């Protein structure tokens, strides 16, 4: 039976990383957040002022407003049988840029490089390039032939039991 404190059950959650105490990097306060970005809430116990509630720890949210010192973040919270929208205002020390769209932005960039080539190619009248193939779950690999010149065989059989004492 725990208590109803604001920071209950935080012996391990709010502990600093091993050999990671003291000041934070200057990239945390220098990184520029724009409205619409994706950020991850990461409570920093070393800064007691403005510490976000521990339930929002590790939640990926979107930036909805940028203030002189605080970055508004919009995350989803689960209630009895519904989902509500929580709007916060955290200092940059307690957040971190999110890489949730890291690979998506490579596929957005690759299709734009092809499209920029296609418009030019149509200007010269030459046939245009095809769009990149979509990602697929690991497909059944096709048949193949193995050259036996550089192939060695090792027999596999159950092993005689050997005592570990």
């Amino acid at each position: 039976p725990l208590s109803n404190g604001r920071n209950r059950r935080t012996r391990k959650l709010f502990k600093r990383p091993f050999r990671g105490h003291g000041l934070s990097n200057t990239s945390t306060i220098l990184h520029t957040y724009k409205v619409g970005d994706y950020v991850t809430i990461l409570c920093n116990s070393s800064i007691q002022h403005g510490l976000p509630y521990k339930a929002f720890h590790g939640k990926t949210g979107r930036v909805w407003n940028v203030n002189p010192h605080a970055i508004g973040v919009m995350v989803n919270k689960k209630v009895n049988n519904r989902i509500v929208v929580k709007r916060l205002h955290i200092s940059p020390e307690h957040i971190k840029p999110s890489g949730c769209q890291k690979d998506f932005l490579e596929r957005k960039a690759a299709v734009a490089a092809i499209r920029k080539q296609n418009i030019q190619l149509k200007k010269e009248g030459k046939p245009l390039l095809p769009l990149p193939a979509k990602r697929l779950p690991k497909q059944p690999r096709p048949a193949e032939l193995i050259k036996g010149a550089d192939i060695k065989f090792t027999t596999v059989a159950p092993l005689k039991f050997e005592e570990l004492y």
């Binding site: 909805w64 407003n65 940028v66 203030n67 508004g72 009895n80 049988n81 989902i83």
Partner: protein, 60 residues
């Protein structure tokens, strides 16, 4: 007459009969509490654009 205190039994089955009601799109587009200067710039342009739109209507 001691009674059972609490149980989470059957609670998840109840919460999913009518599943988690996601918020609508308009929930994410609220603007209350935005930056003060940003709201001032946006209001200034919306007033300027409306007046230009209205004088054409009055012109025709």
């Amino acid at each position: 007459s001691k009674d059972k205190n609490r149980s989470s039994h059957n609670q998840s089955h109840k919460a999913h009969r009518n599943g988690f009601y996601k918020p609508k799109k308009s929930a994410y587009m609220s603007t209350k509490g935005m930056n003060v200067q940003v709201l001032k710039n946006t209001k200034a342009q919306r007033k300027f654009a409306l007046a230009k739109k209205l004088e054409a209507k009055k012109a025709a």
